[PDB]
Design an enzyme around this catalytic site. Structure first.
Site, PDB file in Angstrom:
ATOM      1  N   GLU A 220       9.571 -21.343 -42.670  1.00 21.48           N
ATOM      2  CA  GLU A 220       9.527 -20.689 -43.971  1.00 21.48           C
ATOM      3  C   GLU A 220      10.929 -20.383 -44.576  1.00 21.48           C
ATOM      4  O   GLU A 220      11.166 -19.311 -45.126  1.00 21.48           O
ATOM      5  CB  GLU A 220       8.637 -19.412 -43.928  1.00 21.48           C
ATOM      6  CG  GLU A 220       7.200 -19.760 -43.664  1.00 21.48           C
ATOM      7  CD  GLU A 220       6.248 -18.567 -43.519  1.00 21.48           C
ATOM      8  OE1 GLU A 220       6.686 -17.418 -43.761  1.00 21.48           O
ATOM      9  OE2 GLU A 220       5.049 -18.795 -43.137  1.00 21.48           O
TER      10      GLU A 220
ATOM     11  N   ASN B 282       8.775 -25.961 -40.499  1.00 21.61           N
ATOM     12  CA  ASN B 282       7.399 -25.589 -40.919  1.00 21.61           C
ATOM     13  C   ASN B 282       7.428 -24.746 -42.176  1.00 21.61           C
ATOM     14  O   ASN B 282       8.334 -23.925 -42.333  1.00 21.61           O
ATOM     15  CB  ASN B 282       6.773 -24.754 -39.801  1.00 21.61           C
ATOM     16  CG  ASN B 282       5.286 -24.560 -39.925  1.00 21.61           C
ATOM     17  OD1 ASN B 282       4.521 -25.514 -40.204  1.00 21.61           O
ATOM     18  ND2 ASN B 282       4.833 -23.297 -39.680  1.00 21.61           N
TER      19      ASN B 282
ATOM     20  N   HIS C  81      -2.476 -23.568 -45.650  1.00 25.09           N
ATOM     21  CA  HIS C  81      -3.312 -22.422 -45.967  1.00 25.09           C
ATOM     22  C   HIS C  81      -3.885 -22.653 -47.353  1.00 25.09           C
ATOM     23  O   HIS C  81      -3.304 -22.275 -48.407  1.00 25.09           O
ATOM     24  CB  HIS C  81      -2.485 -21.153 -45.886  1.00 25.09           C
ATOM     25  CG  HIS C  81      -2.055 -20.813 -44.486  1.00 25.09           C
ATOM     26  ND1 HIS C  81      -2.969 -20.569 -43.477  1.00 25.09           N
ATOM     27  CD2 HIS C  81      -0.831 -20.672 -43.934  1.00 25.09           C
ATOM     28  CE1 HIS C  81      -2.318 -20.293 -42.364  1.00 25.09           C
ATOM     29  NE2 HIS C  81      -1.016 -20.332 -42.612  1.00 25.09           N
TER      30      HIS C  81
ATOM     31  N   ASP D 199      -6.408 -23.496 -42.582  1.00 18.89           N
ATOM     32  CA  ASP D 199      -7.581 -22.642 -42.795  1.00 18.89           C
ATOM     33  C   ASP D 199      -7.996 -22.806 -44.275  1.00 18.89           C
ATOM     34  O   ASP D 199      -7.201 -23.263 -45.085  1.00 18.89           O
ATOM     35  CB  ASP D 199      -7.358 -21.162 -42.307  1.00 18.89           C
ATOM     36  CG  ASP D 199      -6.090 -20.529 -42.794  1.00 18.89           C
ATOM     37  OD1 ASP D 199      -5.642 -20.866 -43.903  1.00 18.89           O
ATOM     38  OD2 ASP D 199      -5.594 -19.662 -42.074  1.00 18.89           O
TER      39      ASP D 199
END
Ligand SMILES: [Ca+2]
Length: 348
Positions: free
Chosen positions: A129, A181, A217, A250
């Protein structure tokens, strides 16, 4: 059986809890049986974050060792989550703008943690991030050519900390696959462009980056699968060998940010048996897994991981005060249409 992992030649992972609640992998035999049946990799949801590697100023690997050991005994490799990350809640105490020896402590962290897990962890989120996001800018620092101005950025004066973290990680464990990531990089907007700029800079500097992780996400209906595909395409195009991994998949049924409040499920009973959202969720998991297979060449597939086992375990079970049902298993730990969607994508 089968099991999902049997249907692929790349890791099929799940994030696991280990902090003593209902979802804790160490105590929940039901969850352990699902992991053994279905997955062949785990990511620590929480206990491999930076501060968990310390007890005071000294290193403590007791609890992470326990989890990595559990993986090896139960048919799971480990994706290690994460060497460098900005949230205040998991920064070691050395990671402060008041530490004159920050660069030394940063080196010690990466050197010690990466070496410690050599042979026991397949891959790492080396930096997590690093890209600016207005949705995650609680201090109002603003962007810097697309970088988040975290303590690591501030101390280094720039994005060089990313380069150094990858080098050190490579040197301490040459066997690990090293990933950068991030989230929202699948939207194919500004943050995707910023990702391109980030990764290209690393390749220009000869940095040992082995792949890119897309957290994924996502919502049921945002972003478009065309945009997800093109984002992954953009990153695949940057190098002939760069691997792509889906790290934290997700899928939400509720879209707060869609402009429509009347298509929100406001009650837990709405999707406890059947609703239009669970059926779309099957399709959405399927279309994503299909996008990944189509655009990521065989041999550059770092894996697909879903961000938890069962719905009540999810960080998004309750979010912004609305219920959701984001994962492959329900509360009773039954496979959902979502699970089938993954089955159908992987199998063809
Ligand atoms: Ca809505």
């Amino acid at each position: 059986s089968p099991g999902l992992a049997s249907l692929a030649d790349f890791p099929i992972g799940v994030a696991v809890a280990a902090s003593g609640g209902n979802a804790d992998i160490f105590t929940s035999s039901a969850r352990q049986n699902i992991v053994r049946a279905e997955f062949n990799q785990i990511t620590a949801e929480n206990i491999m974050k930076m501060s968990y590697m310390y007890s005071g100023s000294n290193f403590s690997f007791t609890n992470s060792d326990r989890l990595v050991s559990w993986a090896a005994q139960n048919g799971q490799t480990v994706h290690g989550h994460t060497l460098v990350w900005h949230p205040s809640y998991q920064l070691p105490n050395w990671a402060s703008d008041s530490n004159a020896n920050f660069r030394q402590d940063f080196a010690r962290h990466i050197d010690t943690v990466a070496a410690h897990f050599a042979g026991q962890v397949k891959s790492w989120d080396v930096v997590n991030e690093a890209l600016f996001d207005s949705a995650d800018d609680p201090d109002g620092r603003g962007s810097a050519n697309g970088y988040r101005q975290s303590v690591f950025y501030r101390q280094f004066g720039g994005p060089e900390y990313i380069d150094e973290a990858f080098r050190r990680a490579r040197a301490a464990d040459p066997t690990a696959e090293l990933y950068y990531n991030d989230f929202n990089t699948e939207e194919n907007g500004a943050k995707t462009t910023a990702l391109v700029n980030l990764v290209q800079r690393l390749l220009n500097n000869g940095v040992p980056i082995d792949g890119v992780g897309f957290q994924m996400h996502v919502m049921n209906d945002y972003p478009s699968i065309a945009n997800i595909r093109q984002a992954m395409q953009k990153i695949v195009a940057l190098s002939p060998t760069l691997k792509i991994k889906i790290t934290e998949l997700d899928v939400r049924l509720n879209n707060p940010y869609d402009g429509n409040s009347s298509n929100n499920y406001t009650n837990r009973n709405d999707c406890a048996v059947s609703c239009a959202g669970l059926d779309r969720q099957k399709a959405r998991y399927k279309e994503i897994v299909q996008a990944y297979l189509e655009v990521v060449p065989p041999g550059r597939r770092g894996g697909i991981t879903v961000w938890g086992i069962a719905d009540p375990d999810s960080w998004l079970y309750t979010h912004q005060n609305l219920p959701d049902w984001p994962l492959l298993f329900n509360d009773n730990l039954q496979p959902k249409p979502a699970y089938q969607g993954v089955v159908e994508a992987l199998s063809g």
